[PDB]
Amino acid sequence: MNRARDWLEQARHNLRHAQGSLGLGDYAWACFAAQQAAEAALKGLHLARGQVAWGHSILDLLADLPEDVDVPEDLVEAAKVLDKYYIPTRYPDAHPAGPAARHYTRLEAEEALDLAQKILAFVEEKL
Amino acid sequence: MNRARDWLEQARHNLRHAQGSLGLGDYAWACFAAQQAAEAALKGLHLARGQVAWGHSILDLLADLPEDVDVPEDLVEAAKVLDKYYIPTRYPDAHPAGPAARHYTRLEAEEALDLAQKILAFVEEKL
Numbered sequence: 336m337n338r339a340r341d342w343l344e345q346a347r348h349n350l351r352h353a354q355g356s357l358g359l360g361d362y363a364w365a366c367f368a369a370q371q372a373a374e375a376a377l378k379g380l381h382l383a384r385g386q387v388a389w390g391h392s393i394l395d396l397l398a399d400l401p402e403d404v405d406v407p408e409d410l411v412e413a414a415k416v417l418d419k420y421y422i423p424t425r426y427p428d429a430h431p432a433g434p435a436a437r438h439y440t441r442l443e444a445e446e447a448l449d450l451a452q453k454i455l456a457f458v459e460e461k462l
Numbered sequence: 463m464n465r466a467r468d469w470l471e472q473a474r475h476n477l478r479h480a481q482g483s484l485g486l487g488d489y490a491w492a493c494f495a496a497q498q499a500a501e502a503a504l505k506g507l508h509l510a511r512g513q514v515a516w517g518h519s520i521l522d523l524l525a526d527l528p529e530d531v532d533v534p535e536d537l538v539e540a541a542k543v544l545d546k547y548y549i550p551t552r553y554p555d556a557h558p559a560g561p562a563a564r565h566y567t568r569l570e571a572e573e574a575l576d577l578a579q580k581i582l583a584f585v586e587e588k589l
Contacts, residue, residue: 341559345553345563355483356482359479361482364479434475436472
């Protein structure tokens with residue numbers, strides 16, 4: 336469906352990369368990869384409904400979906416959490432001190448995987 | 463000073479995530495993290511010199527350094543290669559078909575690690 340499948344494939348790969356990052360102990364990177372899984376999955380859902388979407392805000396990605404797509408409120412809350420992982424997980428100036436990587440923990444990254452999985456599952460069922 | 467060191471430590475962490483990614487078999491993510499190690503290292507060098515720099519172009523980051531910093535042609539060549547891993551390693555629309563991930567090889571990832579190490583060593587040297 337005009338590459339929608341390719342983006343879903345990328346989203347699943349990104350989520351596997353976040354799972355493996357968890358195993359490497361690279362929590363901030365796992366969080367970034369989870370936001371990337373969510374982003375790619377939603378861009379794929381947009382493509383399947385004939386739209387091209389942009390950016391890194393999964394909040395906008397969810398808000399711009401066709402009217403016939405019902406978005407549960409829990410996905411909006413997941414979006415707000417994941418949205419803080421696109422830039423702060425990699426750039427030191429997003430935090431008061433130290434490198435970006437040290438501000439992220441395992442529990443945060445597992446929660447990030449959980450939230451991204453909810454997004455992926457919603458997309459897989461709406462495709 | 464000016465957090466140059468926080469950025470260098472982020473660079474090193476990025477390079478370590480690149481090495482783990484190679485271990486996971488996630489070659490496209492290893493290439494992306496290598497570009498991120500180089501980008502963070504050079505941003506750190508600009509901070510050390512009291513300049514702030516922006517973007518994801520290692521080529522522009524090298525070209526914008528102060529006249530007195532000697533940049534071997536080697537690094538410019540390396541920048542050109544790394545610059546192609548910021549977006550294509552994660553986004554399917556940067557390729558003709560399939561997800562982005564399948565278009566990157568183990569050798570590509572091995573070399574990206576080497577090129578980012580070259581860039582990091584240069585920055586540590588001029589720091």
